Every structure is written in structure tokens, then in C-alpha cells.
Design a protein around this ligand. Structure first.
Ligand SMILES: *[C@@H]1O[C@H](CO)[C@@H](O)[C@H](O)[C@H]1NC(C)=O
Ligand SMILES: *[C@@H]1O[C@H](CO)[C@@H](O)[C@H](O)[C@H]1NC(C)=O
Lengths: 48, 43, 42
């Protein structure tokens, strides 16, 4: 349904994940917001 | 004396947790992020 | 992605004997469990 689930402004409701630490096991859910440590040292809860 | 168990990973509101409790008349099963302190207990 | 519970009761250092356990209820739980804690009322 291209027309019935869209608008000129758009839909910001749907959320997906760009990247994550590890794969998800079958039939498992995770809503944690922890950022994977791509840098050499952790950032301790601030988006750096 | 002993009745019920709690399950989870962090055992707090941060992540999901399980809680099963008996109180001598029925069984309550519930999967919610309830607030568990250092050692929960009942009076 | 489930949760199964078995129970058994017997009157009267675990005792010397053989006994079997029957199911009670199966639960669809989508969160993995790694740690568990017991509760006792004083
Ligand atoms: C599932 O298991 C992984 C590794 O054991 C752990 O990091 C993760 O926190 C668990 N899931 C939940 C929802 O706690
Ligand atoms: C105690 O048992 C009653 C059943 O009469 C139940 O409704 C109640 O939820 C139980 N208490 C807790 C903390 O679950």
C-alpha cells in the first residue's frame, strides 16, 4: 500500500537499526540503545 | 518459606525481566521490568 | 523462544529414590534469560 501508508511530510514513526553489536538469535527481541564501540575507546553514554 | 523466582539479564527497568510469584492461593506470572533492589524480600 | 516448567511433590542430603516430573505450563517468552534469583517470605 504505497498511498495508504505515506504522506508528503513522511513517516518518522518506523524505527530500524543501522548497525548493532551482535546478531540476534531466532525469535529474540532487543530494544536496548547501547552503542557498539567502533572507536578505540568507549564514549560512556555520549554520542561522540 | 520460599515462593517464586525472578529471571532476567540486568534485573532492573533498563532491560526486560521476568517475575513469577506464589502467595499460597494462586500463581502470578508476569514479564515486566520491575524495580529489583539489592535483595528483594517479603514481610 | 519458550519457557517450560515441570513439578513433582513427595512426602519426606537428597533422598535415595527415583521419581519423575510432569509438565505444568509452557510460556512464550521472547527474552533470553541468563541470571535468576529466588524469593522467600520471612
Ligand atoms: C541475550 O544474551 C546476550 C549474550 O548472552 C546478552 O548480551 C543479552 O543481553 C541477552 N538479551 C537480553 C534481552 O538481555
Ligand atoms: C496474591 O494472591 C492474589 C490471589 O488472591 C493475587 O490476586 C495477587 O496478585 C497475589 N499477589 C501478588 C503480589 O501477585
Amino acid at each position: 500500500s504505497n498511498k495508504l501508508d505515506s504522506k508528503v511530510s513522511g513517516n518518522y514513526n518506523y524505527l530500524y537499526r543501522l548497525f548493532r553489536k551482535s546478531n540476534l538469535k531466532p525469535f529474540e527481541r532487543d530494544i536496548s540503545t547501547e552503542i557498539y564501540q567502533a572507536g578505540n575507546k568507549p564514549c560512556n553514554g555520549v554520542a561522540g | 518459606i520460599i515462593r517464586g523466582w525472578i529471571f532476567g539479564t540486568t534485573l532492573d527497568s533498563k532491560t526486560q525481566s521476568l517475575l513469577i510469584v506464589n502467595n499460597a492461593t494462586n500463581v502470578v506470572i508476569k514479564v515486566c521490568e520491575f524495580q529489583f533492589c539489592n535483595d528483594p524480600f517479603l514481610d | 523462544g519458550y519457557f517450560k516448567i515441570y513439578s513433582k511433590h513427595t512426602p519426606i542430603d537428597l533422598p535415595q529414590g527415583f521419581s519423575a516430573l510432569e509438565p505444568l505450563v509452557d510460556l512464550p517468552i521472547g527474552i533470553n534469560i541468563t541470571r535468576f534469583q529466588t524469593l522467600l517470605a520471612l
